[PDB]
Amino acid sequence: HSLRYFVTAVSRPGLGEPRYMEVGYVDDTEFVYEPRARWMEQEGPEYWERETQKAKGNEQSFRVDLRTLLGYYNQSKGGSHTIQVISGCEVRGYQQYAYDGCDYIALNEDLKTWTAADMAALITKHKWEQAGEAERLRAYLEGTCVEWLRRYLKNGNATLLRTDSPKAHVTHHSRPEDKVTLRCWALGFYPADITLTWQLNGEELIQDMELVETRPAGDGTFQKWASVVVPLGKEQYYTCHVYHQGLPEPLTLRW
């Protein structure tokens, strides 16, 4: 189980100030300054305010950042520019910066040393040591992050650990000139991490499969599917293997 924040600072010039957000996920799950994972409501006001205040403080802080980087990049006060950050811990600690899509700054395996991606972040790195944020950080991560992280589940290990198993079935679709395209399916399962793979006589089939990015449904559950194009009459040679965590044993189907 883990807790991560995903920060977003996007300068849309002429269009006001930068749109900034802060999001939380215990694991792949959203939760938060109106919180959006119900069980979190179990926290009061004087939580939500020391908190929101924070966003305002960063909204304000990145505002500088957003700018200082044009600085560092010779850039312009022209187009948009986006800064993202991922700060969070497991129970590996995250503090990851990207700017515009490209990697920027990062905290390495033993959080005490960074890694920049270019002359830029390079002269953001060299400062943070002249300001030891390596440690200003080390703590939080090891420190309070975990405290919140654990001090969180408790308010929802009810769903923050639930696990509705996936429900497969395989379809049969004709392909011109004697070929049929089998489609194993995978509905209503959570978490979204699943693994659907076809097999022809026990051989994996990761050469001509056609998986679909595991898509969400609208009710926590997820759906996904893997497709194979098999010659006519010769289906029962090809089997589908579903492996999801809330599954005593991985499934297996033939249609």
Binding site: N58, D65, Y97, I105, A131
Partner: peptide, 8 residues
């Protein structure tokens, strides 16, 4: 429950 980052 976020952290506070030192301007770049």
């Amino acid at each position: 429950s976020i952290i506070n980052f030192e301007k770049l």
